[PDB]
Coordinates of C-alpha atoms in Angstrom, one line a residue:
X1 CA -4.4 33.4 -2.0
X2 CA -6.9 33.8 -4.9
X3 CA -8.1 31.1 -7.3
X4 CA -7.2 33.1 -10.5
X5 CA -3.5 32.8 -9.4
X6 CA -3.4 29.0 -9.6
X7 CA -2.5 27.6 -13.0
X8 CA -3.7 24.3 -14.4
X9 CA -0.6 22.1 -14.8
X10 CA -2.0 18.7 -15.9
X11 CA -4.4 9.6 -10.5
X12 CA -7.8 11.0 -11.1
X13 CA -6.9 14.4 -9.6
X14 CA -6.0 17.7 -11.0
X15 CA -2.8 19.7 -10.0
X16 CA -2.4 23.4 -10.0
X17 CA 0.7 25.5 -9.9
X18 CA 1.3 28.7 -8.1
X19 CA 3.1 29.8 -11.2
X20 CA 1.3 33.1 -11.6
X21 CA 1.5 34.6 -8.1
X22 CA 3.3 37.5 -6.4
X23 CA 2.4 36.1 -3.0
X24 CA 4.6 34.3 -0.5
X25 CA 4.7 30.5 -0.8
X26 CA 5.5 30.9 -4.5
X27 CA 7.3 27.5 -4.7
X28 CA 4.5 25.1 -3.9
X29 CA 1.8 23.3 -5.9
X30 CA -1.8 22.3 -5.2
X31 CA -3.7 19.1 -6.1
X32 CA -7.4 18.6 -6.0
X33 CA -9.7 15.7 -7.0
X34 CA -12.9 16.9 -8.8
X35 CA -15.5 8.1 -1.6
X36 CA -16.1 4.9 0.2
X37 CA -15.4 4.3 3.9
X38 CA -13.1 1.4 3.1
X39 CA -11.3 3.6 0.6
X40 CA -10.9 6.5 3.1
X41 CA -9.7 4.0 5.7
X42 CA -7.0 2.6 3.4
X43 CA -5.9 6.1 2.3
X44 CA -5.7 6.9 6.0
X45 CA -3.3 4.1 6.7
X46 CA -1.3 5.0 3.6
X47 CA -1.0 8.5 5.1
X48 CA 0.2 7.0 8.3
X49 CA 2.6 5.0 6.2
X50 CA 3.8 8.0 4.3
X51 CA 4.3 10.2 7.3
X52 CA 5.5 7.8 10.0
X53 CA 6.6 4.4 8.6
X54 CA 8.1 5.2 5.1
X55 CA 10.7 7.6 6.4
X56 CA 12.3 4.7 8.3
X57 CA 13.0 2.8 5.0
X58 CA 13.8 5.8 2.7
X59 CA 15.7 8.9 4.0
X60 CA 13.6 12.0 4.3
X61 CA 15.9 13.9 1.9
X62 CA 14.7 11.7 -1.0
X63 CA 11.0 12.1 0.0
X64 CA 8.6 14.9 -1.0
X65 CA 6.7 16.7 1.7
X66 CA 3.0 17.3 1.5
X67 CA 0.6 19.3 3.7
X68 CA -3.1 18.7 3.8
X69 CA -5.3 21.8 3.3
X70 CA -9.0 22.8 3.6
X71 CA -10.5 24.8 0.7
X72 CA -13.8 26.7 0.9
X73 CA -16.8 25.5 -1.2
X74 CA -17.0 28.5 -3.5
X75 CA -13.3 28.7 -3.8
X76 CA -13.2 25.2 -5.3
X77 CA -15.9 25.9 -7.9
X78 CA -14.1 28.9 -9.3
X79 CA -10.9 26.9 -9.7
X80 CA -12.5 24.2 -11.9
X81 CA -14.5 26.4 -14.2
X82 CA -11.3 27.8 -15.9
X83 CA -9.6 26.2 -18.8
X84 CA -13.4 20.2 -0.6
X85 CA -9.9 19.6 0.9
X86 CA -6.7 19.2 -1.1
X87 CA -3.0 18.9 -0.7
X88 CA -0.1 21.3 -1.1
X89 CA 2.9 19.8 -2.7
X90 CA 6.4 20.9 -3.7
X91 CA 6.3 22.7 -7.1
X92 CA 9.2 20.9 -8.7
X93 CA 8.1 20.9 -12.3
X94 CA 6.8 24.4 -12.8
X95 CA 8.6 27.7 -13.5
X96 CA 9.0 29.2 -10.1
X97 CA 12.3 31.2 -10.2
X98 CA 12.8 35.0 -10.4
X99 CA 15.7 34.3 -12.7
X100 CA 13.4 33.5 -15.6
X101 CA 15.4 30.3 -15.3
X102 CA 13.7 27.4 -17.1
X103 CA 12.8 24.3 -15.0
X104 CA 14.0 21.0 -16.4
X105 CA 12.6 17.8 -14.8
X106 CA 12.7 14.1 -15.6
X107 CA 10.6 11.2 -14.4
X108 CA 11.9 7.7 -14.6
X109 CA 10.3 4.3 -13.9
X110 CA 13.5 2.3 -13.1
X111 CA 11.7 -1.0 -12.7
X112 CA 13.2 -4.0 -10.9
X113 CA 16.9 -3.6 -10.0
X114 CA 17.5 -7.3 -9.7
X115 CA 16.8 -10.8 -10.9
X116 CA 15.4 -13.6 -8.6
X117 CA 17.8 -16.4 -7.8
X118 CA 17.4 -19.7 -9.5
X119 CA 17.4 -21.3 -6.0
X120 CA 14.1 -19.8 -5.1
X121 CA 12.1 -20.3 -8.4
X122 CA 9.4 -22.9 -7.9
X123 CA 8.3 -24.5 -11.2
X124 CA 11.5 -25.9 -12.8
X125 CA 10.2 -25.0 -16.2
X126 CA 10.2 -21.3 -15.3
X127 CA 13.6 -21.2 -13.6
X128 CA 15.8 -20.4 -16.6
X129 CA 13.4 -17.7 -17.8
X130 CA 12.9 -15.7 -14.6
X131 CA 16.5 -16.1 -13.7
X132 CA 17.7 -14.5 -17.0
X133 CA 14.8 -12.4 -18.3
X134 CA 13.7 -9.3 -16.4
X135 CA 10.2 -8.6 -15.3
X136 CA 10.3 -5.6 -17.6
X137 CA 11.1 -7.7 -20.7
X138 CA 8.6 -10.4 -19.7
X139 CA 5.8 -7.8 -19.2
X140 CA 6.7 -5.9 -22.4
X141 CA 6.5 -9.2 -24.3
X142 CA 3.2 -10.1 -22.8
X143 CA 1.6 -6.9 -24.1
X144 CA 2.7 -7.5 -27.6
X145 CA 5.4 -4.8 -27.4
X146 CA 9.1 -5.3 -28.5
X147 CA 10.4 -8.3 -26.6
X148 CA 13.9 -6.8 -26.5
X149 CA 13.7 -3.1 -25.5
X150 CA 16.8 -0.9 -25.6
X151 CA 16.4 -0.1 -21.9
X152 CA 17.6 -2.7 -19.4
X153 CA 16.9 -2.0 -15.7
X154 CA 20.0 -4.0 -14.7
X155 CA 22.1 -1.6 -16.7
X156 CA 20.6 1.4 -14.7
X157 CA 21.1 -0.4 -11.4
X158 CA 24.6 -1.7 -12.2
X159 CA 26.5 1.3 -10.9
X160 CA 28.6 1.3 -14.1
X161 CA 28.7 4.7 -15.8
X162 CA 28.7 3.3 -19.3
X163 CA 25.9 0.9 -18.5
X164 CA 23.7 3.6 -16.8
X165 CA 24.3 5.7 -19.8
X166 CA 23.1 3.0 -22.2
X167 CA 20.0 2.6 -20.1
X168 CA 19.2 6.3 -20.3
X169 CA 19.8 6.3 -24.0
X170 CA 17.4 3.3 -24.3
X171 CA 14.8 5.3 -22.3
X172 CA 15.2 8.2 -24.8
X173 CA 14.8 5.8 -27.7
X174 CA 11.6 4.2 -26.4
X175 CA 10.3 7.8 -25.6
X176 CA 11.0 8.8 -29.2
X177 CA 9.4 5.7 -30.7
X178 CA 6.4 6.1 -28.5
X179 CA 6.3 9.8 -29.4
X180 CA 6.5 10.7 -25.8
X181 CA 3.6 8.5 -24.6
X182 CA 5.8 6.0 -22.8
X183 CA 5.3 6.2 -19.0
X184 CA 8.8 5.0 -18.3
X185 CA 10.4 8.3 -19.4
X186 CA 8.9 11.8 -19.0
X187 CA 10.6 15.1 -19.6
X188 CA 9.2 18.4 -18.3
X189 CA 10.2 21.8 -19.6
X190 CA 8.6 25.0 -18.3
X191 CA 6.1 22.6 -16.6
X192 CA 5.1 21.4 -20.1
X193 CA 5.4 17.7 -20.8
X194 CA 7.6 17.6 -23.8
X195 CA 7.1 15.4 -26.9
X196 CA 9.7 14.6 -29.5
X197 CA 8.5 17.2 -32.0
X198 CA 8.5 19.9 -29.3
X199 CA 12.3 19.2 -29.1
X200 CA 12.9 20.3 -32.7
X201 CA 10.6 23.2 -32.3
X202 CA 13.0 26.0 -31.4
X203 CA 11.3 27.6 -28.5
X204 CA 14.2 27.6 -26.0
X205 CA 17.7 29.2 -25.6
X206 CA 19.0 25.6 -26.0
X207 CA 18.5 23.7 -29.2
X208 CA 16.6 20.4 -29.2
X209 CA 19.4 17.8 -29.4
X210 CA 21.8 19.8 -27.2
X211 CA 19.0 19.8 -24.6
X212 CA 18.8 16.0 -24.8
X213 CA 22.6 15.6 -24.2
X214 CA 22.6 17.9 -21.1
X215 CA 19.5 16.2 -19.7
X216 CA 21.1 12.8 -20.1
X217 CA 24.4 13.9 -18.5
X218 CA 22.6 15.8 -15.8
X219 CA 20.4 12.8 -14.9
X220 CA 23.4 10.5 -15.2
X221 CA 25.4 12.6 -12.7
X222 CA 22.5 12.9 -10.3
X223 CA 21.7 9.2 -10.3
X224 CA 25.3 8.2 -9.6
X225 CA 25.7 10.6 -6.7
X226 CA 22.4 9.7 -5.0
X227 CA 22.0 6.5 -3.1
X228 CA 18.5 6.1 -4.5
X229 CA 19.3 3.3 -7.0
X230 CA 21.3 1.1 -4.7
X231 CA 18.8 1.7 -1.9
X232 CA 15.8 0.9 -4.2
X233 CA 17.3 -2.4 -5.3
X234 CA 17.8 -3.6 -1.7
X235 CA 14.3 -2.7 -0.7
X236 CA 13.0 -4.4 -3.9
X237 CA 15.1 -7.5 -3.2
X238 CA 14.8 -7.8 0.6
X239 CA 11.0 -7.5 0.7
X240 CA 10.7 -10.1 -2.0
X241 CA 13.6 -12.4 -0.8
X242 CA 12.5 -15.8 -2.2
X243 CA 10.3 -14.7 -5.2
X244 CA 6.5 -14.8 -5.5
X245 CA 6.5 -18.4 -6.7
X246 CA 8.0 -19.7 -3.4
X247 CA 5.8 -17.3 -1.3
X248 CA 2.8 -18.8 -3.1
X249 CA 4.2 -22.3 -2.2
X250 CA 4.4 -21.3 1.5
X251 CA 0.8 -20.2 1.3
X252 CA -0.3 -23.6 0.0
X253 CA 1.2 -25.5 2.9
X254 CA -0.8 -23.3 5.3
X255 CA -4.1 -23.3 3.4
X256 CA -4.4 -26.4 1.2
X257 CA -8.0 -25.7 2.0
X258 CA -8.4 -22.7 -0.4
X259 CA -7.3 -21.2 -3.7
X260 CA -3.9 -19.4 -3.4
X261 CA -4.0 -15.9 -1.9
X262 CA -7.8 -16.0 -1.5
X263 CA -8.9 -12.4 -0.7
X264 CA -11.2 -13.6 2.1
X265 CA -8.1 -15.2 3.6
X266 CA -6.0 -12.1 3.5
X267 CA -6.9 -9.5 6.2
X268 CA -6.4 -5.8 5.6
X269 CA -3.2 -4.3 7.1
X270 CA -3.4 -1.8 9.9
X271 CA -0.8 1.0 10.4
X272 CA 0.2 -0.7 13.7
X273 CA 0.8 -4.1 11.9
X274 CA 2.6 -2.4 9.0
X275 CA 4.8 -0.4 11.3
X276 CA 5.5 -3.5 13.4
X277 CA 6.9 -5.4 10.5
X278 CA 9.0 -2.6 9.2
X279 CA 10.8 -2.4 12.5
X280 CA 11.6 -6.2 12.4
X281 CA 12.7 -5.6 8.8
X282 CA 15.1 -2.8 9.8
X283 CA 16.6 -5.1 12.5
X284 CA 17.6 -7.6 9.9
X285 CA 16.7 -6.8 6.2
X286 CA 18.2 -10.1 4.8
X287 CA 16.2 -12.2 7.3
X288 CA 13.6 -12.9 4.6
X289 CA 16.0 -15.4 2.9
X290 CA 15.9 -17.8 5.9
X291 CA 12.9 -19.8 6.9
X292 CA 13.1 -19.2 10.6
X293 CA 12.4 -15.5 10.4
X294 CA 9.3 -13.8 8.9
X295 CA 5.8 -15.2 9.3
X296 CA 3.5 -15.9 6.3
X297 CA 1.4 -12.8 7.1
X298 CA 4.6 -10.8 7.4
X299 CA 5.8 -12.1 4.0
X300 CA 2.5 -11.1 2.4
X301 CA 2.9 -7.6 3.9
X302 CA 6.6 -7.5 2.8
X303 CA 5.7 -8.5 -0.7
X304 CA 3.1 -5.7 -0.9
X305 CA 5.7 -3.3 0.2
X306 CA 8.1 -4.7 -2.4
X307 CA 5.5 -3.9 -5.1
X308 CA 5.7 -0.2 -4.2
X309 CA 9.5 0.1 -4.6
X310 CA 9.3 -2.1 -7.7
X311 CA 6.8 0.2 -9.4
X312 CA 7.9 3.6 -8.1
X313 CA 9.4 6.5 -10.0
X314 CA 12.6 8.6 -9.8
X315 CA 12.6 12.3 -10.2
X316 CA 15.5 14.5 -11.4
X317 CA 15.2 18.3 -11.5
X318 CA 17.5 20.7 -13.3
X319 CA 17.6 24.4 -14.2
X320 CA 18.3 26.1 -17.5
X321 CA 19.8 29.4 -16.4
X322 CA 21.5 32.6 -17.8
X323 CA 25.3 31.6 -22.4
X324 CA 22.7 29.1 -21.3
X325 CA 23.6 26.1 -19.1
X326 CA 21.8 23.2 -17.4
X327 CA 22.4 23.0 -13.7
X328 CA 21.2 20.8 -10.8
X329 CA 19.4 22.4 -7.9
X330 CA 19.4 21.0 -4.4
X331 CA 18.8 17.2 -4.1
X332 CA 17.9 16.8 -7.8
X333 CA 16.8 13.2 -7.3
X334 CA 13.6 12.3 -5.4
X335 CA 11.7 8.9 -5.0
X336 CA 8.0 9.4 -5.7
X337 CA 4.8 7.5 -6.1
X338 CA 5.2 5.6 -2.9
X339 CA 1.6 5.1 -1.8
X340 CA 0.5 1.8 -0.3
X341 CA -0.8 -0.9 -2.6
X342 CA -3.8 -3.1 -1.5
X343 CA -2.5 -6.3 0.1
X344 CA -5.4 -8.4 -1.5
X345 CA -3.9 -7.6 -4.9
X346 CA -1.2 -10.2 -4.3
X347 CA -3.4 -12.8 -5.9
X348 CA -3.6 -10.6 -9.0
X349 CA 0.2 -10.2 -8.8
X350 CA 0.8 -13.9 -8.6
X351 CA -1.5 -14.5 -11.5
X352 CA 0.2 -11.8 -13.6
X353 CA 3.6 -13.3 -12.7
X354 CA 2.8 -16.9 -13.7
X355 CA 1.0 -15.7 -16.9
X356 CA 4.0 -13.7 -18.1
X357 CA 6.6 -16.4 -17.8
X358 CA 4.2 -19.0 -19.3
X359 CA 3.6 -16.7 -22.3
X360 CA 7.3 -16.3 -22.7
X361 CA 7.9 -20.1 -22.6
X362 CA 5.1 -20.7 -25.1
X363 CA 6.3 -18.1 -27.6
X364 CA 10.0 -17.3 -27.1
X365 CA 11.7 -20.1 -25.2
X366 CA 13.7 -20.5 -22.0
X367 CA 16.0 -17.4 -22.1

């Protein structure tokens, strides 16, 4: 339990791995930061959300456990020299096996697993675009990136083996072109975040390109077996049942008074309010489609929840062991980055949404 034994392993926090330790509790990691009351408050409800509410929507098997811990003052200062209270995580990316087995991990940002129905899209000018062009393609185009990326989220969420394979290859392609700086695809080997030139550097029992093939196949197999992708799509869809454009329309009927999604008009969400809605949601997830179901406040809450599952990540872990082979360990797929998003940000989200389809119309067209 000494500070020397923790190894620096890459939001604005720092993570450490117990990857140089002969003690018990070898297979866990530690994250430490280096605070406003309103910030602590929100992070407290997010915790309540993470512990009590979120397991209702996503099965516990696909969730990562965390335990809050108190570290002495001196203890912390020693740990940050080398080149408060923190949290103990599962060490899924580091080398933790007696075997000398090499840990192989992949992080994917799957994006939206669906397209909004034409029947719900508000401005008629935008209907054909949002009904046929994914948010990913729209957002990519807006930032001046390639307007037709090789990765298509609908391929990954399709359930078709050849389609899912094409999506994974597309993720590899963008990773290579971005020289490993793309956030959509991250590969971890020996806890080190790999870049394309690290691949052709021969430091492993497995060659560069042979590693890529097994990683793709390993991930492909893991994603097909897990219910993570079909489950994610339904949460993305149900919590945003009639698109942001119509939800914005509903808001205007209620408050012709004010600008749309005015922050002063949107109250902060309590754990009690949040948990209350999730229970009604579980009772009938597809209720959001009808107009005699969820309230406006509930829809704003639902949409904020939708944003989490839309922007979350998928984690696939494998092991290079022993001839050398790539093998899956336990439940290789996990759904991570599931913290709460501030509900007042819906105004920003609506503005981002209108802006991306408008930019597409202005420069590329209607499809």
